[PDB]
DNA sequence: GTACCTACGGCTTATGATTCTTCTCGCTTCCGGCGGCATCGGGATGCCCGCGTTGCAGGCCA
């Protein structure tokens, strides 16, 4: 938190997608793990 | 020395909603009794004749 040495980060509102809809679905949470 | 909060996932149980069972209002109108009279087919009653019912004794069956 040094105003001359810190490195913050900014969030954007670029797009409005349905990721939050699949956040808690028990179906999207089961199909999303495709890390293979 | 001690108490109270939620996320990660599944089955159930504690209560407001919709299709299937049931309880029975409305009378009115076409339809079903209801009674009287002419009609017709059956049959009970009588006589005749042969067949259906029954007793005896034997051979067959459950």
């Amino acid at each position: 938190m040094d105003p001359e040495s810190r490195r913050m980060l900014r969030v954007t509102v670029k797009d409005a997608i349905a990721a939050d809809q699949l956040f808690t679905t028990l179906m999207g949470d089961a199909v999303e793990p495709r890390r293979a």
Side-chain angles (χ1 to χ4, degrees), chain A residues 2-15:
Chain A
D2 190 359
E4 293 179 353
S5 296
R6 66 183 180 179
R7 185 178 296 112
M8 293 182 286
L9 188 151
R10 184 176 179 179
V11 66
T12 61
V13 296
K14 182 67 180 294
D15 291 331

Side-chain angles (χ1 to χ4, degrees), chain A residues 15-33:
Chain A
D15 291 331
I17 62 171
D20 291 331
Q21 297 294 321
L22 281 72
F23 182 76
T24 182
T25 302
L26 189 280
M27 186 66 204
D29 291 331
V31 66
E32 182 66 26

